[PDB]
Structure formats: C-alpha cells, structure tokens
C-alpha cells in the first residue's frame, strides 16, 4: 502493498510523465460501487523511476550503498534444464513478474494499492508468453476489485506493467517486482534547501519529468522507447 496518506508516486504525483496524461485505457473493470476502473499500461511509471534513480552505468539518485530500503516485493525463480526435454515441476522456459498500482479516488481516507504477481512460463515461444501476460492484466484487475470491496475502497485508475526473460538451457531466471519506499536528496530538487522541507516536495510535485531532466541537465534514459523490461 500500500501507498497511503504519507505517499506520492514517481512519474505520477511528483516528476509526472507526459505519457501518463496522454494514455488510453486498455480495458475497464467494474468496482463494488458500480464505477468503472480504467486499466492502463504502467510503462510511463516504470520508465520514470529509471530517470530518477539512473542505471548502473549512469547512476543518478539511487539508494545509498548499504542503506535499508523497505520494498513491497515478490519474485520467482525457475531453472531451464541444460539438456532435458522433461521439465520437473519447479522448472520452465521463462520467468515473468508484474506490478499494478491503483490510485484511491479519495486519498485522505483510502490507501492506494499495489498488487504484484510473478510466475513461471512453460512454453519456448515468447509470443505465447506475451498473450498470456495480457491475460494476467485481467486477472490482476479482478483481484484489485475484490481487495477494494474488502476495504470499500474505490480507485481512480490502475497501471499494470510486466517484466520477463526467456532463459537458455541451463540458466536460472529470477523475475522480481518491487515498489521501493524512499527519501529524496536535496540535490535532486532544483532550488530545494534542507531548510525548506515542505517547499522541496512542492517543487518536485510541480515539475514534470521533461522539466526536471532539463533543470538537472540530464539526458532522457527512456526517450524513444529505449527501456525494455
């Protein structure tokens, strides 16, 4: 999971991605109270975190070496056998993970929520895994509406996104899904000061991701769909 009354989400609430406002829903889900819930692809949001944290070759505001970061997380491991036609039940050809964020319509009383999923794929054909993965978005939207009913929480939108890898004979794959919960350093805040804590969060909330990249003098790591998960 949950991000509630204390939180904001990178790429949406602070450093908003432009592709969020331009996104069209993939489908809608009905919630306990009769409203439609639009489901979107979360790729703008996944990408935004790469812009802020940076990559291993181009490190930006990543977590300190050896810090403790609480994360809402899950993962799955599976082996592809090195020379076996028989997969024993822990084994498979590919591994995938998923994350969904659903924003509460009323954030002063309901929390926004993450549901995460992960699993093994048992076919050598990647096109078939991609077909399966669009079906996991419907399955996750169904579980979000049920978790919502349980707490009588209504949500404004859900953004679901995926990662995967097909492994070669004799490899182990690990697919992970994580929502980190962090603190922002002053140097990532254009005009921030340690002395103005509240104002620092407003600055970050007022800048979109293009604007922040400009003000910092950073190139766009995600620009012409460069990032793939």
């Amino acid at each position: 999971x949950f991000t509630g009354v204390q939180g904001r989400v990178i790429g949406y609430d602070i450093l908003r991605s432009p592709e969020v406002d331009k996104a069209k829903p993939l489908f809608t889900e009905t919630q306990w109270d009769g409203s439609e819930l639009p489901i979107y692809d979360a790729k703008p949001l996944q990408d935004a975190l790469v812009e802020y944290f940076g990559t291993e070759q181009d490190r930006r505001h990543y977590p300190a070496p050896g810090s403790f970061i609480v994360c809402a997380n899950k993962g799955v491991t599976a082996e592809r056998p090195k020379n076996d036609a028989d997969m024993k039940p822990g084994q498979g050809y590919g591994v995938w993970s998923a994350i969904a964020i659903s924003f509460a319509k009323d954030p002063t009383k309901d929390s926004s929520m993450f549901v995460e999923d992960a699993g093994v794929w048992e076919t050598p054909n990647e096109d078939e895994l991609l077909e399966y993965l669009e079906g996991r978005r419907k399955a996750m939207a169904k579980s979000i509406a049920e978790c919502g009913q349980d707490a009588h929480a209504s949500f404004e939108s859900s953004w679901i996104g995926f990662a995967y890898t097909m492994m070669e004979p004799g490899q182990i794959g690990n697919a992970i899904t994580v929502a980190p919960y962090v603190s922002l350093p002053i140097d990532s805040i254009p005009g921030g000061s340690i002395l103005t804590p509240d104002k620092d969060m407003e600055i970050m909330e007022n800048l979109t991701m293009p604007e922040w990249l400009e003000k910092m003098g950073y190139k766009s790591l995600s620009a012409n769909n460069a990032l793939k998960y």
């Binding site: 204390q6 994350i99 964020i101 603190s183 921030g192």
Partner: protein
C-alpha cells in the same frame, strides 16, 4: 497540493527528504526529514547459469535484476506484504 492541506489537519505530512548528497534513503532510516515517503515501480528479470547451489544461483540472478535498468544495487531490502 490541496491534498496536503487536508492531510496536515489530520497530523499527516508527505515530506520525505534525505540528508545525503546524491543518494536516496529508505523510509524510517534515522536522519530523514519529514514523516512521509515516496515510491515508484520496478519490475525486472535477471539470469545466472545453473550451478551446483540453488541459494547462490538465487542470490546472483536476483542481484542482476536489481542492477538491471533502474539501479537499486547494494541496498538491504526489507519486505512489506
């Protein structure tokens, strides 16, 4: 935003500032300013060739997924479920 004025009346704030140069820090680590937090989305996968030890195979393929795309290498991950 207007939200923070409703939240603030309840005793809640959304401030999450790290005292360090360059680095973000985790929610609840001593020395952060404010009682809020910021989050984001990372799904990634990593692989390692199979060895004789599942635990080490687990550790390295995890470490590669952490180090893939948005960098969260060398952090101590605690789990919230």
């Amino acid at each position: 935003s207007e939200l923070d004025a409703k939240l603030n009346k309840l005793g809640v704030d959304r401030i999450a500032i790290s005292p360090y140069k360059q680095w973000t820090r985790g929610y609840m680590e001593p020395g952060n300013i404010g009682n809020g937090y910021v989050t984001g989305l990372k799904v990634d996968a990593g692989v390692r060739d199979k060895s004789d030890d599942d635990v080490l195979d687990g550790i390295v393929s995890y470490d590669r997924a952490e180090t893939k795309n948005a960098y969260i290498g060398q952090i101590n991950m605690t789990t919230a479920s």
